[PDB]
Enzyme design. Sequence first.
Site, PDB file in Angstrom:
ATOM      1  N   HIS A  41       0.801  -1.223   0.000  1.00  0.00           N
ATOM      2  CA  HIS A  41       0.000   0.000   0.000  1.00  0.00           C
ATOM      3  C   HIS A  41       0.840   1.282   0.000  1.00  0.00           C
ATOM      4  CE1 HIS A  41      -0.085  -0.202   4.525  1.00  0.00           C
ATOM      5  NE2 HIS A  41       0.083   1.109   4.389  1.00  0.00           N
ATOM      6  N   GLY A 143       2.235   5.852   9.548  1.00  0.00           N
ATOM      7  CA  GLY A 143       3.638   5.744   9.169  1.00  0.00           C
ATOM      8  C   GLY A 143       4.358   4.546   9.776  1.00  0.00           C
ATOM      9  N   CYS A 145       3.535   1.475   9.382  1.00  0.00           N
ATOM     10  CA  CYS A 145       3.425   0.367   8.431  1.00  0.00           C
ATOM     11  C   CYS A 145       4.773  -0.047   7.896  1.00  0.00           C
ATOM     12  CB  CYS A 145       2.447   0.719   7.312  1.00  0.00           C
ATOM     13  SG  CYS A 145       0.819   1.231   7.918  1.00  0.00           S
TER      14      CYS A 145
HETATM   15  O1  LIG Z   1      -4.174   1.243   8.631  1.00  0.00           O
HETATM   16  C1  LIG Z   1      -3.419   2.148   8.299  1.00  0.00           C
HETATM   17  N1  LIG Z   1      -2.701   2.795   9.232  1.00  0.00           N
HETATM   18  C2  LIG Z   1      -2.337   2.260  10.434  1.00  0.00           C
HETATM   19  N2  LIG Z   1      -1.956   1.015  10.671  1.00  0.00           N
HETATM   20  N3  LIG Z   1      -1.341   1.003  11.912  1.00  0.00           N
HETATM   21  C3  LIG Z   1      -1.384   2.223  12.363  1.00  0.00           C
HETATM   22  N4  LIG Z   1      -1.998   3.051  11.472  1.00  0.00           N
HETATM   23  C4  LIG Z   1      -2.502   4.423  11.669  1.00  0.00           C
HETATM   24  C5  LIG Z   1      -3.975   4.634  11.602  1.00  0.00           C
HETATM   25  C6  LIG Z   1      -3.261   4.740  12.911  1.00  0.00           C
HETATM   26  C7  LIG Z   1      -3.548   2.864   6.952  1.00  0.00           C
HETATM   27  C8  LIG Z   1      -4.302   4.207   7.056  1.00  0.00           C
HETATM   28  C9  LIG Z   1      -5.776   3.953   7.236  1.00  0.00           C
HETATM   29  O2  LIG Z   1      -6.327   3.215   6.126  1.00  0.00           O
HETATM   30  C10 LIG Z   1      -5.626   2.099   5.730  1.00  0.00           C
HETATM   31  C11 LIG Z   1      -6.344   1.172   4.988  1.00  0.00           C
HETATM   32  C12 LIG Z   1      -5.735  -0.005   4.591  1.00  0.00           C
HETATM   33  C13 LIG Z   1      -4.413  -0.219   4.910  1.00  0.00           C
HETATM   34 CL1  LIG Z   1      -3.640  -1.694   4.399  1.00  0.00          CL
HETATM   35  C14 LIG Z   1      -3.680   0.705   5.626  1.00  0.00           C
HETATM   36  C15 LIG Z   1      -4.286   1.882   6.063  1.00  0.00           C
END
Ligand SMILES: O=C(Nc1nncn1C1CC1)[C@@H]1CCOc2ccc(Cl)cc21
Lengths: 304, 304
Positions: A41, A143, A145
Amino acid sequence: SGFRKMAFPSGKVEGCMVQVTCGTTTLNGLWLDDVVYCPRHVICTSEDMLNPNYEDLLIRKSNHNFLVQAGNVQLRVIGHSMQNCVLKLKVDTANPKTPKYKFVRIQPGQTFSVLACYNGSPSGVYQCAMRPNFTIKGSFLNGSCGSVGFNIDYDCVSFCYMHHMELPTGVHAGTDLEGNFYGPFVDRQTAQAAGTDTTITVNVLAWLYAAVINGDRWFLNRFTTTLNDFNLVAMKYNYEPLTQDHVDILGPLSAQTGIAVLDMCASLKELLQNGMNGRTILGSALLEDEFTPFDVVRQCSGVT
Amino acid sequence: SGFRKMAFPSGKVEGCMVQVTCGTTTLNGLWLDDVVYCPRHVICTSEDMLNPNYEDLLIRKSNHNFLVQAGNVQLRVIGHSMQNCVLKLKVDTANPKTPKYKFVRIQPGQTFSVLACYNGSPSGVYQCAMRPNFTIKGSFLNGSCGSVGFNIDYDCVSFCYMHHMELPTGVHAGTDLEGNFYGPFVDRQTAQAAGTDTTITVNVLAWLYAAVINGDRWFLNRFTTTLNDFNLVAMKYNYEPLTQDHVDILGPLSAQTGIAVLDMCASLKELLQNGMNGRTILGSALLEDEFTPFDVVRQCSGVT
Ligand SMILES: O=C(Nc1nncn1C1CC1)[C@@H]1CCOc2ccc(Cl)cc21
Ligand SMILES: O=C(Nc1nncn1C1CC1)[C@@H]1CCOc2ccc(Cl)cc21
């Protein structure tokens, strides 16, 4: 003596962390040999995340679009391929800090250390269990990820997890290092049900053995039980059914303490049915399930 | 989101760990520049520990008696000196992996990471708080002595603790890197009273703010309190009295959540008086005090 939620020393993994940027998105990559691994992603904009067609999105990208930075030096990308939910960026330089490593798919209930990173830089390290429902309860912000989970057996790092996302419920989901999600999850911004979770029974029993070794014995009782009787209680309290394989893995701790596994099951049964009565076990007011029997033996024996 | 008991990445400290042997005793040393720091009790036999005369014992030792091994290579000892409860072994080679570092004396209630080591090799890393009574509740077995506690601010490691001993009660005691014990403790095998411990109030409040940020809000109530009223409750429950300095340090979290510090104190007051009623906060069934306000801001903002 003493018992802590100990993580592996993160040094060998710190030397592998890089920053990967594609367009406006930056996340973490894992540089091993001449390959950088990162969540696929990284090629999406937040807008693309609602229903991304990764194949089409990746086709618009070239080697020069993936900016890989290790500390302050830039890595030259000479190849890119998508394997399941991860991108593999071939670089022209092998990581000089590459430790001896393996890629492993861990089982639900097993534990691992997470090196949380942002912009390719390590922020902290903590010990996790992969839940029976294939989620992890981590500490991950935007960030993070691409941060990885791992185990270490002397000089070999077994990488088992790469972080991809946070579900709407606040729990975390990711893949093995071949990009296969643990659980039913998809890398898409959609509501996704994580299954009913359960408590990792064998780990609670391992932790009760750790408590006895380290001095906390108040919960030991005059009772015993059978696997059948215990499992009726485990069912009622949403605990994983105990099997003879779990009893077998508890063998070393049973031998060390002299407390038969089914006698420890009877202590656990009474704790489930009566609670702690305001007491603590190893500094905790709940039944801890994020230590495996192997973790307890390792910590109690000082394996380096 | 998510909140974990996160330790600092241990890489910079792993590169400083060495094994120090004197006679029959082996423990861990910290190699920084051309100096190796270790607990002075490396010169004792278990027999000497009942009432050691360190000055007399050290006089019988020469540079060649201190065997310092970094990984698989031997370091040449060219000087030895005792500073308080630590020995400083001057070696002929500066550690090439020496990070930017400082020696700091932390305050009671502050937190730090411990890299537990055996025979100069890292086994694990965990986050600790220095108790108000100057003990730490660690995980340390025989040979762990010389393992260090530290903090990291970007590229600088502030070493604050070196492990020396386990009291008869199972809690741990050690020194700053100048060899001054934290607390009333002496490096001798004798019964030693650790003072009455208390809960680190400012840390519990910081952790309640972390809970609100990360979604756990059930404990928020319609009440407020005063520092005086709250402190009468803190007295009864063996909590550290809250001061305006603590309220001031909680300022950023109060600003972030919009919950006034005294309103959070009223939630804490009700939790102390009524318990959790079988509920949890951030996965815990007790009031957690091993996160400072700085730790909460750091973890919630992703500082690397
Ligand atoms: O989840 C994600 N971020 C995330 N994962 N651990 C921490 N965080 C941040 C939010 C606190 C991203 C952004 C949100 O939308 C998505 C949608 C699908 C995927 Cl794969 C990634 C993401
Ligand atoms: O405390 C010590 N060991 C220790 N500290 N953390 C873990 N451990 C082992 C026991 C589990 C040593 C041995 C016991 O007798 C003494 C007496 C004074 C001093 Cl300074 C050190 C020691």
